[PDB]
Amino acid sequence: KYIEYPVLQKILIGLILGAIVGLILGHYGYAHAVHTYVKPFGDLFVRLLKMLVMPIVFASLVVGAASISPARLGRVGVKIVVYYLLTSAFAVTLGIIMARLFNPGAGIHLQPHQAPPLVHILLDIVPTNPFGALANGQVLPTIFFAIILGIAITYLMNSENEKVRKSAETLLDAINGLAEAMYKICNGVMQYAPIGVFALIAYVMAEQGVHVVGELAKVTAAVYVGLTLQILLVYFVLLKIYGIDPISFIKHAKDAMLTAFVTRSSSGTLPVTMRVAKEMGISEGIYSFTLPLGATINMDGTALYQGVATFFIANALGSHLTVGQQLTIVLTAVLASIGTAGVPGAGAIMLAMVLHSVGLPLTDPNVCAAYAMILGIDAILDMGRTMVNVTGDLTGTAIVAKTE
Amino acid sequence: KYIEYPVLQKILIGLILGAIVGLILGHYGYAHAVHTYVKPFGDLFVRLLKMLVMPIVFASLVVGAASISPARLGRVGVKIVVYYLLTSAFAVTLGIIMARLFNPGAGIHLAVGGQQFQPHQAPPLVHILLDIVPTNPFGALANGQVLPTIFFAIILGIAITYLMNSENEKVRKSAETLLDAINGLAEAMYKICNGVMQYAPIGVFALIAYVMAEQGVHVVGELAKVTAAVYVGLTLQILLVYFVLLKIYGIDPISFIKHAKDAMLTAFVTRSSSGTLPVTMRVAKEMGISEGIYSFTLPLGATINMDGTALYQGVATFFIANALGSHLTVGQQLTIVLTAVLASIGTAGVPGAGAIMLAMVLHSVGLPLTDPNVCAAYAMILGIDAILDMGRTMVNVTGDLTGTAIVAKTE
Amino acid sequence: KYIEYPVLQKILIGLILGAIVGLILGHYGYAHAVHTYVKPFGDLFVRLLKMLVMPIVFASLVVGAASISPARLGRVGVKIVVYYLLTSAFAVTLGIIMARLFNPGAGIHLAVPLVHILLDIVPTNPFGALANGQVLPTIFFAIILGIAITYLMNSENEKVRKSAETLLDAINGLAEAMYKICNGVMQYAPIGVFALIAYVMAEQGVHVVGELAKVTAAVYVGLTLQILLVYFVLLKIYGIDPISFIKHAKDAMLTAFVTRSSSGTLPVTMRVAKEMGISEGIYSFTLPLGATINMDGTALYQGVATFFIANALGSHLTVGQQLTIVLTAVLASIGTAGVPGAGAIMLAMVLHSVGLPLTDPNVCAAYAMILGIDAILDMGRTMVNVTGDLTGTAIVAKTE
Ligand SMILES: N[C@@H](CC(=O)O)C(=O)O
Ligand SMILES: N[C@@H](CC(=O)O)C(=O)O
Ligand SMILES: N[C@@H](CC(=O)O)C(=O)O
Ligand code: NA
Ligand code: NA
Numbered sequence A: 001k002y003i004e005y006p007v008l009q010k011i012l013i014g015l016i017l018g019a020i021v022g023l024i025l026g027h028y029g030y031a032h033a034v035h036t037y038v039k040p041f042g043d044l045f046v047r048l049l050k051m052l053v054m055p056i057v058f059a060s061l062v063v064g065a066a067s068i069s070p071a072r073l074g075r076v077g078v079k080i081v082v083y084y085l086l087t088s089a090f091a092v093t094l095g096i097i098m099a100r101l102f103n104p105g106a107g108i109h110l111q112p113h114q115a116p117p118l119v120h121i122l123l124d125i126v127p128t129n130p131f132g133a134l135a136n137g138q139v140l141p142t143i144f145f146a147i148i149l150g151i152a153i154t155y156l157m158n159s160e161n162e163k164v165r166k167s168a169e170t171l172l173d174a175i176n177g178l179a180e181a182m183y184k185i186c187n188g189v190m191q192y193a194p195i196g197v198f199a200l201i202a203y204v205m206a207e208q209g210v211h212v213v214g215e216l217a218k219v220t221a222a223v224y225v226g227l228t229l230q231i232l233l234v235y236f237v238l239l240k241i242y243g244i245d246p247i248s249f250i251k252h253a254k255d256a257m258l259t260a261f262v263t264r265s266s267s268g269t270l271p272v273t274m275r276v277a278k279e280m281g282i283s284e285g286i287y288s289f290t291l292p293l294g295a296t297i298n299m300d301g302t303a304l305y306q307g308v309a310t311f312f313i314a315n316a317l318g319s320h321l322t323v324g325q326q327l328t329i330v331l332t333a334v335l336a337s338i339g340t341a342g343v344p345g346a347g348a349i350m351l352a353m354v355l356h357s358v359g360l361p362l363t364d365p366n367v368c369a370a371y372a373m374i375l376g377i378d379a380i381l382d383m384g385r386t387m388v389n390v391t392g393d394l395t396g397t398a399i400v401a402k403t404e
Numbered sequence B: 001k002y003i004e005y006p007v008l009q010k011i012l013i014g015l016i017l018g019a020i021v022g023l024i025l026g027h028y029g030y031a032h033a034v035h036t037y038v039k040p041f042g043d044l045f046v047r048l049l050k051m052l053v054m055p056i057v058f059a060s061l062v063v064g065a066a067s068i069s070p071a072r073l074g075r076v077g078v079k080i081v082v083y084y085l086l087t088s089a090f091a092v093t094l095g096i097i098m099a100r101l102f103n104p105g106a107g108i109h110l111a112v113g114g115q116q117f118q119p120h121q122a123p124p125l126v127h128i129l130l131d132i133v134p135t136n137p138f139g140a141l142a143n144g145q146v147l148p149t150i151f152f153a154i155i156l157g158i159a160i161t162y163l164m165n166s167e168n169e170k171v172r173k174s175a176e177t178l179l180d181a182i183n184g185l186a187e188a189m190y191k192i193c194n195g196v197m198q199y200a201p202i203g204v205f206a207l208i209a210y211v212m213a214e215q216g217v218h219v220v221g222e223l224a225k226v227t228a229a230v231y232v233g234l235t236l237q238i239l240l241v242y243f244v245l246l247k248i249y250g251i252d253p254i255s256f257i258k259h260a261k262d263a264m265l266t267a268f269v270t271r272s273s274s275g276t277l278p279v280t281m282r283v284a285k286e287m288g289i290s291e292g293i294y295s296f297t298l299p300l301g302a303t304i305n306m307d308g309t310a311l312y313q314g315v316a317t318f319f320i321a322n323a324l325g326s327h328l329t330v331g332q333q334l335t336i337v338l339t340a341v342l343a344s345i346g347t348a349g350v351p352g353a354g355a356i357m358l359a360m361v362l363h364s365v366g367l368p369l370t371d372p373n374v375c376a377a378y379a380m381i382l383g384i385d386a387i388l389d390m391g392r393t394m395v396n397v398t399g400d401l402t403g404t405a406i407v408a409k410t411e
Numbered sequence C: 001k002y003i004e005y006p007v008l009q010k011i012l013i014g015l016i017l018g019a020i021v022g023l024i025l026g027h028y029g030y031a032h033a034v035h036t037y038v039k040p041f042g043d044l045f046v047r048l049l050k051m052l053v054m055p056i057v058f059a060s061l062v063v064g065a066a067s068i069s070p071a072r073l074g075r076v077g078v079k080i081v082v083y084y085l086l087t088s089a090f091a092v093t094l095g096i097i098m099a100r101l102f103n104p105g106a107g108i109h110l111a112v113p114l115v116h117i118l119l120d121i122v123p124t125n126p127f128g129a130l131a132n133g134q135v136l137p138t139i140f141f142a143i144i145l146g147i148a149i150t151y152l153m154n155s156e157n158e159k160v161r162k163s164a165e166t167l168l169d170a171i172n173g174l175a176e177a178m179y180k181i182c183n184g185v186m187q188y189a190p191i192g193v194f195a196l197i198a199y200v201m202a203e204q205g206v207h208v209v210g211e212l213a214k215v216t217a218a219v220y221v222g223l224t225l226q227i228l229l230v231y232f233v234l235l236k237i238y239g240i241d242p243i244s245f246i247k248h249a250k251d252a253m254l255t256a257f258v259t260r261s262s263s264g265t266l267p268v269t270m271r272v273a274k275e276m277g278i279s280e281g282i283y284s285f286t287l288p289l290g291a292t293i294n295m296d297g298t299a300l301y302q303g304v305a306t307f308f309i310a311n312a313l314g315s316h317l318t319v320g321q322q323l324t325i326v327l328t329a330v331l332a333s334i335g336t337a338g339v340p341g342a343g344a345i346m347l348a349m350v351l352h353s354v355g356l357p358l359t360d361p362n363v364c365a366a367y368a369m370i371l372g373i374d375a376i377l378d379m380g381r382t383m384v385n386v387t388g389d390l391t392g393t394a395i396v397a398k399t400e
């Protein structure tokens, strides 16, 4: 196959090259040649992610749910979990604002059902038959239940019976790996990403004209200017109130951010994140505990990412978001960020989750396309997103080591 | 949350307190305030049990099926398994009689929200005897459809045991791990059932509250008509089965109860046959039972042989049937006994267990829980379940010790 | 229970004596009891086969997909993949000639794209798919799943390495358990088969007579003809003994022929794969894959049927649809499960394409006479699909 190139560039080629080929066929050779000979390669890519969604959702959430479970942790974690909870919680609230002062999707307009009298949906979050729910789509209850199980398991491990203790581990580990196996396919999909994305954005550059680019960069801005604002108004702020020098903090994390920015793998940048921790005076039994938990949990760069991407979709349909469903985003996107893997694609797919909630199924055509536009450019947003995901751990690690 | 109270009382408060509040709103503040502000809390409770049904059914039956499998047992068990089979088998037959001389449900006939239940007919025997066999295990296990889920799950539970005796080591290993995955999956469920029983006080309160506001007091006259049919069947089991088979083997039946005094009464209160086991083992030594005998029967009697439940279901069914006004046919009546036993063998030995296994003995015979009229009628049993549960457990434990004292006579 | 006998013979009792009591009480007899108190024991059997297929295919083709872990990455398959294509894409070519030399149709003639489907090889959600039917993707996923897991095997992390095996081993046994059920089914088969081929001996066979046996001709002297001018053809050119080849398979095919199930006679297929010196990994992969895709016996059959239907109408085939048949007919044997009924059914879209809908009565009728004799025809067809896999398995094993 001879296709050995470094993924990031290898894809950033198919993005810029795919744009132009789309525009040169925006005029000239018209719109029916692409909608038949290029996009069929796009859908494939997307549907390979679709594929992954339900199992990853399920498995990831259980593995996540068994990793947190209170109280299966020392109070050394309590300070940082609360930190993780609130650094992620406010992150998406900021994402709302970036989706408020910037309105991406509104003007790109290219139909959903009502809500029952609150009773049913608050009940509907509870599955009827776990299998049947997990079977065909329906994400919302899949969450609820999966968690309830992930918790149950941890309490089988502390049960006095040895076989019961044994039953817990094995089962959990079966879901784990099932978890992990998924990701090697996600990476197996990211090898198809260059040929995949090329076809996608190519279709979106042929139809809809150039108005897309004026909105794509309007998303990308709303995101990146929210990202740095997070660092400046949250990190830089909470660094000052605890006596830590915020300028030299960045100089010590210089390698930890920039290696994470390029690789886009928070779970892969961890030894680099651990190496930086020692270089600025953080205790052993402190950073060997927080960083391995920050590698999976606390994904504020993603939590925000989804909170915006949603508004995009909403406005790209021309649907106005209500409060009650707006405060659902923040409730979901967090649970979504806590679920996310810490790998190239991860976030994008977890977005699907924060979409099936609020009444936006991916089986619907208008969702497919609009989502695929985010998915095409995902790679760009992904880089900065990761960079912030890693900063959130070290800042918390430097903060929790102050009051200990 | 500060809600630390002992479950039994903590719930028996919400039952008696919930009754009165229902009746005082039976008149006065009328029927539309409850059907909107209290019952939405009830359904939640119920649906948390619904949730559990399919997986527990599946997992429990496989774990059960791999625990019995003949011949994966010494002849020391053959005498007691046959005993377990026939003590449970006749128990529900008695339950039929208690549902015959007492007719609970007949005269309570309801249509709830305007939906008179009209279940469907039976095909010419061929299809259903075939339909017990799944088309695609997954698809069956997926959306409801309990009947074939049973059949298949068992067939698997048996298969597994025969992978363990296979000469290949990796195959032997494959068997254990897989089975253990289903196990735990089995067990994990139960910690959620107990997690549901912590919601039971707030749950049940809302349920019986709705049933005391609508239908009037005629419910109580029938609820206690069930409870009677049950309890007077329960003691009759002990007196006409246990006390009878105790006499034919030379065992003194009066002092037997004096030695099992702690074993019954601790089981009566806790309602956990799987939790009362060390107490059941301690009593066994106190009346002269051999070691390699009670260390084998009691751990098997803790899960299998649930005659107090087998009967419980055999009645509860008639309740539902008559509560709809549907007359039960023989052919389907002898299905009850066939099912309720397999249901009792599946049941866990924990606070809720039985009630949920009832759902199983309902999907069989043509009574799905997706149907509205079933929901409500079942929820009435589920509300009072806690009461029946206590005596049920007490009998479930007596059935093991009596068998243990009997099988140690001819050995 | 007394019933312990070897099945080699036990069903050969219930088949030979399945023909005696069948015909004797097939004449006179009355009450047509076979279709009321006998068949309910025939179908029961079949139904258990329909039960296994999904699980086993899944369980197996993750397990087999987890052993070839760079035995050639997985590009051992690439070779057999294409073996499958041309065993099929030449089997149908033979059927076109079979239907050129035999004309079942005229004499009783009367008036009473590619896109989505290839994407559809990729599933939406495993569970949803896996749950209710849906074959191809179920494979696809499992294969790809199988692959991924092995990369977890050698991954530097200890518990993650551990995550794989435990999980996989769970998928195994879930495999092996299923297998040992196929053989609780075959110990029932004497009772099963007897009951069914009692219905097959009361009607069928002597019906309706020539035009149908005109197909049955183009069938059996084409099936057997496949073997000789294809299988034995490449057996020689790959140094594999044609004589013993069949004799190593002696029981595999002769069970498959009777059982008519691909996935019910896969246990024996592999038990025969061991008998002729085949490596576990290779066979534990190819066979289960071929045990669904490459059903050449069907690929041929469907064509002849199509032609029969066409010639039975009085409307004739241009080499503008002729080519598209050799095209679609394969894609049908691609999607066919491997269980008794599906042959005639899948045959539908090789007719819907080309353009012959079962909504014109002439169709959903003439068809229903091929559908009549299918019961007989299904037996011969089955046997072929399986051989034409073992064949390729050995051939590709030769180049290793
Ligand atoms: N790839 C990101 C996670 C994401 O895509 O959401 C990371 O490693 O931090
Ligand atoms: N809880 C009962 C079982 C049941 O509810 O059926 C017991 O432990 O014996
Ligand atoms: N049952 C056949 C396929 C068919 O003709 O339907 C086989 O397994 O080979
Ligand atoms: Na995460
Ligand atoms: Na992180």
Ligand code: NA
Residues within 6 Å of the ligand: B302, B303, B304, B305, B306, B344, B345, B346, B347, B348, B349
């Ligand atoms: Na039981």
Ligand code: NA
Residues within 6 Å of the ligand: B273, B301, B302, B303, B304, B305, B306, B307, B396, B397, B399, B400
């Ligand atoms: Na018991």
Ligand code: NA
Residues within 6 Å of the ligand: C262, C290, C291, C292, C293, C294, C295, C296, C385, C386, C389
């Ligand atoms: Na085949």
Ligand code: NA
Residues within 6 Å of the ligand: C292, C293, C294, C295, C332, C333, C334, C335, C336, C337, C338
């Ligand atoms: Na096929």
